[PDB]
Curated annotation (Swiss-Prot), chain B:
The modification Phosphoserine is found at S128. SUPFAM superfamilies: NAD(P)-binding Rossmann-fold domains, Siroheme synthase middle domains-like, Tetrapyrrole methylase. Gene3D superfamilies: Cobalt-precorrin-4 Transmethylase, Domain 1, Methyltransferase, Cobalt-precorrin-4 Transmethylase, Domain 2, NAD(P)-binding Rossmann-like Domain, Sirohaem synthase, dimerisation domain, Siroheme synthase, domain 2. Keywords: Cobalamin biosynthesis, Lyase, Methyltransferase, Multifunctional enzyme, NAD, Oxidoreductase, Phosphoprotein, Porphyrin biosynthesis, S-adenosyl-L-methionine, Transferase. One of its GO terms (molecular function) is uroporphyrin-III C-methyltransferase activity. The active site is at D248, K270. It comes from the Bacteria. Pathway: Cofactor biosynthesis; adenosylcobalamin biosynthesis; precorrin-2 from uroporphyrinogen III: step 1/1; Cofactor biosynthesis; adenosylcobalamin biosynthesis; sirohydrochlorin from precorrin-2: step 1/1; Porphyrin-containing compound metabolism; siroheme biosynthesis; precorrin-2 from uroporphyrinogen III: step 1/1; Porphyrin-containing compound metabolism; siroheme biosynthesis; siroheme from sirohydrochlorin: step 1/1. InterPro entries: 4pyrrol_Mease, 4pyrrol_Methylase_sf, 4pyrrole_Mease_sub1, 4pyrrole_Mease_sub2, CobA/CysG_C, NAD(P)-bd_dom_sf, Siro_Cobalamin_biosynth, Sirohaem_synt_dimer_dom_sf. This is Siroheme synthase.
């Protein structure tokens, strides 16, 4: 260990920053967030410093480094781009035993400012010890994704439950298991941040009312179109806490590798037999009743041609809490990765997400669809490519209207094919499921916005 | 934040610990490992202290607490079994502006000792401030298994190569590209751990003899509707390593907090609003400089904003670019309000929208409508929808600040539409369709 980390209380304590440029501004913003009684000393100050001063957030001392300025300070930071001046601040700081930091010379002075993850009162700090700030940022990025947004809320709330916990659970091992469950309760944390007192009370009582070992709930998570990088921070957080994961085939392999090493997995997709929806709905409810934290992982988004509503309406008089985490829908993913915006200046503003045929029980609206400037996007329509081609130009759609097909969008094997409407059914026998059909003038923009490799 | 973490260099610097029991022993052990010049003042001492004292690792002062023992100290730690003496230590330290910790009283004094995970020279610290000590213990455990055992070797080597990297590459973009390839090389890491210098040098020479691109780039990133948890993994990565970020007012402040702290930021808004051409210009200019530029937009860049416009000239300019999709307001707002955009017979068509609009096409059904920027045209929407064939009774819903902790949802029917719209402000979304009916058979986020 070459540095000792300490967490300093700065509320209303004198700190000094020398310098007034952009580097000095970051430092000031940070010290201010911690509540320091801050003085900034420099020859000139950028606009943001005048603003803070004009609203009573700090004190400005315009001029060259005034050493007496350190006389009653607890912390100093040399943030100028003149090494000689920074050196003098460092020397003056050290003479009076004031911990001091010199921005681009991390080990020349008293302390190093680490990269921080803020979930106050909970906080994590990472330091290179001066070797690799790049590595420190990489770690911050990883830690920011692993720590839910409102973790601080429950850290702060634990105090108001400690007593009741010791009262109901008399064994050390029991109270620990309680906190383990308490600290990963995202619904409670959110409710506290929402200032929703009834939900806070409801979720709190349930934590004491249910058996210690039960953590019953259902979470619908949108996995995105395939690229593991498109999963949401909350989705990953949810998936890492699951006891059981119920997924289908349109959930990528890269995504499943992110699922908690030994959470049970239940595949309910098309096996090389169709699992009926009511059986899927029933497994979610059943295992949540058994006390397991259930995550229903869905391809793309849960409420868009995903039948997510059905898997939830079966949960209201079961007394099983639930929640939804949206995901990037196939339309959004394929759009961005194919260089085809769904909306562009004139071409635009009506975007229609429509279903094709595997999914039926009535029949399709040709001119309502064949109608003017709206971008059309068909889900599950590869088996009616030609049947869509004929019924579109028949109702007025101009045969030279651009179209495109995107197979396995956002994945390393993404295939994009394109042309005009009179080639639809033909370009389709050049792709396989899963794929989307995009009809509209926005398709031509790809000649300028294409950035992802084709296969 | 209620505490600011800092990493102190304690070598040859005086520190003082008051107390000589087990609590004081663990404290002394860390300070010694940090290389501090330690003095321990206590009425009584346990064996280990004597061990350290005759090995010349510290100085012992036997007897009651002496206020003058703090006169040349940088840090003070009170660890006696007497609460009264412990605060005589903190009061004495404060008079001298010396950071001080009282072990059994975290809400007191001036600093707290966090839990540590050691991978020297790399180090990670975590603390609750005393609010949730079990929370921090649990996290330290998780972090110990998450961080590779030999990560310190890679970090150490990186520091040693720093001087050569700068002299071999001129631009920031190749030096940045070097480190990205560096920390991703599993052979290098495994080689350092197996102290096989041959393998280390072989791989190292190849990284240095590589032609790395020097140009910057523009990356469009979807921030989503507001909730920071809805940012994508890749979106977080991009804002975490960007050189500069261009953002508007629809990027929540929580998401803005996830941005690299030492990156520049340009507000593109209602301060009017850097008329697109102006924004479009900022992008290519900053990228021309070799910077990694991130245009952070609300929701999804290819559905709501002028994302296409912001990139359609970059190919001509020879500037690399990419797009990271985000959760659309339509998807987030609807889902957080308990309204799914589609259900079994309900919809087979979803429509996102915005003088004119084709009312007969937006009024026919078996569909779910979503209006994006339509609060001041709201009265005319129902009128046109009702006139072109839509069923009064049809449910409608407006969502304000959807997905945020301040979310609000009003509900009603086409006829009350123009009214409900004065029951809320911007930014707000309007959902028309049947699916708005199962809102409280599925409502999960808030009660308002
Ligand atoms: N990676 C992908 N690339 C192209 N289309 C995809 C896709 N993933 C899903 N799809 C489309 O989605 C259809 C199944 S319906 C499920 C859609 C999903 N809930 C979503 O929100 O995206 C497929 O037939 C296909 O048309």
């Amino acid at each position: 260990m070459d540095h000792l980390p300490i967490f300093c209380q700065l509320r209303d304590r004198d700190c000094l920053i020398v310098g007034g440029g952009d580097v000095a501004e970051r430092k000031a913003r940070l010290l201010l967030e911690a509540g320091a009684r801050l003085t900034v000393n420099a020859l000139t100050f950028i606009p943001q410093f005048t603003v803070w001063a004009n609203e009573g957030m700090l004190t400005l001392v315009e001029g060259p480094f005034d050493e007496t300025l350190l006389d009653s300070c607890w912390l100093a930071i040399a943030a100028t781009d003149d090494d000689t001046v920074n050196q003098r601040v460092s020397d003056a700081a050290e003479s009076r035993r004031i911990f001091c930091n010199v921005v681009d010379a991390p080990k020349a002075a008293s302390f190093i400012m680490p990269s921080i993850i803020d979930r106050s009162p909970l906080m994590v700090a990472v330091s290179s010890g001066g070797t690799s700030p790049v590595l420190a940022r990489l770690l911050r990025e990883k830690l920011e994704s692993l720590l839910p947004q409102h973790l601080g809320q429950v850290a702060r709330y634990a105090g108001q439950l400690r007593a009741r916990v010791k009262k109901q659970f008399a064994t050390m091992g029991e109270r620990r298991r309680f906190w383990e469950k308490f600290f990963v309760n995202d619904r409670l944390a959110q409710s506290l941040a929402n200032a929703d007192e009834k939900a806070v009370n409801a979720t709190t009582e349930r934590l004491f009312s249910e058996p210690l070992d039960h953590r019953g709930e259902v979470v619908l998570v949108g996995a995105g179109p395939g690229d593991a990088g498109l999963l949401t921070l909350k989705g990953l957080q949810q998936i890492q806490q699951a006891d059981i994961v119920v997924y289908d085939r349109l959930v990528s392999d890269d995504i499943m590798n992110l699922v908690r090493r030994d959470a049970d997995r239940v595949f309910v997709g098309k096996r090389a037999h169709c699992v009926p929806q009511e059986e899927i709905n029933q497994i979610l409810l059943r295992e949540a009743q058994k006390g397991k934290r259930v995550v229903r992982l869905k391809g793309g988004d849960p409420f868009i041609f995903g039948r997510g509503g059905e898997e939830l309406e079966t949960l209201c008089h079961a007394g099983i809490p639930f929640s939804v985490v949206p995901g990037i829908t196939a339309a959004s993913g394929c759009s961005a990765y194919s260089g085809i915006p769904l909306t562009h200046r004139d071409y635009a503003q009506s975007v229609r997400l429509v279903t094709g045929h595997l999914k039926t029980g009535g029949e399709l609206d040709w001119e309502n669809l064949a109608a003017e400037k709206q971008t059309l996007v068909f889900y599950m329509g590869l088996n009616q490519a030609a049947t869509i081609q004929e019924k579109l130009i028949a109702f007025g759609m101009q045969a030279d209207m651009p179209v495109a097909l995107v197979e396995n969008g956002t994945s390393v094997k993404q295939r994009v094919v394109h042309g005009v409407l009179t080639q639809l059914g033909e370009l389709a026998q050049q792709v396989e499921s899963p794929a989307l059909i995009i009809v509209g003038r926005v398709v031509a923009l790809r000649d300028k916005l294409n950035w992802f490799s084709n296969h």
